């Protein structure tokens, strides 16, 4: 089975990760003459890392999600990606987040025994603050464009999935409080949060404080209370 091959790729890539994580130490203890070389090496190893996750073979204009998905179904794989994220450019990191969203229900299924998906919440949250509104909207659009739509049961019932959804909504709120397209996905989201039975909802890792303010824009008082109770909102 390839799962053996995947574990190999994980070990290969994880080794690069430890090197890049050790970089500041080496640079700090280096002679000036060595620094140019240290910097080039760092660059190529970060490229290599991204390529092992999201590289594409000849004849394809977009990478296959295969390799990324395979890695993300493995305990150490998810923890590795969490630690690679901070080293990637914003554009590379957003790709990883969009790919995660596109494949989220399957990744959730494959995380049922390990439950390590939450290790990605922190780096994704840091990333979200660096992303514009078009991006925030596109990610939410992808989450609502999965099998079962417009029902998001698998996501809402998952600690990481719910938390991630709440972080996205929160950041979207920020950006709008600075268009209508954002308003459309917001309506869908509140509808879905309103539908899901409270007993089914996962316990969110964190609850953004601006959520109440966000929901007020699209929903009346009676329903607002529902959400607040449902999500133990602040
Ligand atoms: K792989």
Swiss-Prot record:
Residues of the full protein shown: 517 to 766 of 770
Protein name (record): Protein PAT1 homolog 1
UniProt remark on domains: The region A, also named N-term, mediates the interaction with DDX6/RCK and is required for cytoplasmic mRNA processing body assembly. The region C, also named Pat-C, is required for RNA-binding and mediates the binding with the Lsm-containing SMN-Sm protein complex and the decapping machinery. It folds into an alpha-alpha superhelix, exposing conserved and basic residues on one side of the domain.
Tissue distribution: Ubiquitous.
Coiled coil: none
Region (Involved in nuclear speckle localization) location: 1-234
Gene assigned in the entry: PATL1
Localization of this protein: Cytoplasm, P-body; Nucleus; Nucleus, PML body; Nucleus speckle
Superkingdom, natural source: Eukaryota
Region of interest (Region C), residue spans: 1-234
């Amino acid at each position: 089975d390839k799962r053996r091959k995947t574990l190999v790729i994980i070990e290969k890539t994880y080794s690069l990760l430890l090197d890049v994580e050790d970089y500041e130490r080496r640079y700090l203890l280096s002679l000036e003459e060595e620094r140019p070389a240290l910097m080039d090496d760092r660059k190529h190893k970060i490229c290599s890392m991204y390529d092992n996750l999201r590289g594409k073979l000849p004849g394809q204009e977009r990478p296959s999600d295969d390799h990324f998905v395979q890695i993300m179904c493995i305990r150490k794989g998810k923890r590795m990606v969490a630690r690679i994220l901070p080293f990637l450019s914003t554009e590379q990191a957003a790709d990883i987040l969009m790919t995660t969203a596109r494949n989220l229900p399957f990744l959730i299924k494959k995380d049922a025994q390990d439950e390590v998906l939450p290790c990605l919440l922190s780096p994704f949250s840091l990333l979200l603050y660096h992303l514009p509104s078009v991006s925030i909207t596109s990610l939410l659009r992808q989450l609502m464009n999965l099998p079962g739509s417009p029902h998001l049961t698998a996501v809402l019932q998952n600690k990481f999935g719910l938390s991630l959804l709440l972080i996205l909504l929160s950041r979207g709120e920020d950006l709008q409080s600075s268009n209508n397209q954002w308003t459309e996905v917001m309506f869908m989201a509140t509808r879905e949060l309103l539908r899901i039975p409270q007993a089914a909802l996962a316990k969110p890792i964190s609850i953004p404080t601006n959520l109440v303010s966000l929901f007020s824009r699209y929903v009346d008082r009676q329903k607002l209370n529902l959400l607040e109770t449902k999500l133990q909102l602040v």
